[PDB]
Amino acid sequence: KVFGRCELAAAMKRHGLDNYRGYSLGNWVCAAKFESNFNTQATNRNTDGSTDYGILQINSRWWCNDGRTPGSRNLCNIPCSALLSSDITASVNCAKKIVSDGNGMNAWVAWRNRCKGTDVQAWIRGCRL
């Protein structure tokens, strides 16, 4: 499913991401935008053999199991395919574990290079939240 900007903001807000660990809703929507362009079915293979899955492009090396990433962790205890669902629940719950890991949202390369330090509030403008 390809989410609309405001549609995703409402879904994330409902799942408790607004201000989660200090990150305003705009940050999460901005990350999703540049990580997957709001597409829950986005996948991307990396040089190390791991793959990124879903709206927030969660990596198979540490967070989910896809059966083809040797010696990888499944810290979120879920098959990576679950992160491609039109229902973002799995993605959101795993993201909450990732952002609490220590480096905050810097774990997401797109957020660090394209959202961090910008006017992220602009991503939820005009939305009925």
Side-chain angles (χ1 to χ4, degrees), residues 1-106:
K1 170 180 178 165
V2 176
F3 275 82
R5 178 171 65 82
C6 292
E7 173 180 33
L8 181 63
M12 292 182 140
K13 186 189 179 80
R14 204 248 299 186
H15 284 74
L17 280 186
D18 184 28
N19 292 310
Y20 187 76
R21 214 51 73 131
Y23 293 93
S24 65
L25 195 57
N27 283 284
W28 299 99
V29 175
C30 183
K33 170 66 182 181
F34 296 123
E35 284 292 346
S36 63
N37 196 41
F38 302 145
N39 188 358
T40 64
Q41 299 191 68
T43 59
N44 281 291
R45 198 71 181 290
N46 301 118
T47 62
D48 70 350
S50 64
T51 301
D52 298 317
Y53 299 76
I55 203 75
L56 288 174
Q57 293 287 276
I58 293 170
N59 191 267
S60 63
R61 178 66 67 184
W62 317 84
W63 316 100
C64 61
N65 176 56
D66 63 3
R68 70 170 192 189
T69 311
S72 62
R73 294 285 202 63
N74 182 9
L75 294 179
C76 285
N77 286 287
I78 56 173
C80 301
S81 58
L83 299 176
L84 305 178
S85 174
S86 55
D87 186 311
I88 68 173
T89 302
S91 287
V92 171
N93 289 357
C94 184
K96 294 182 177 179
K97 296 186 181 177
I98 296 172
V99 73
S100 302
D101 193 54
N103 281 173
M105 284 195 77
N106 290 295

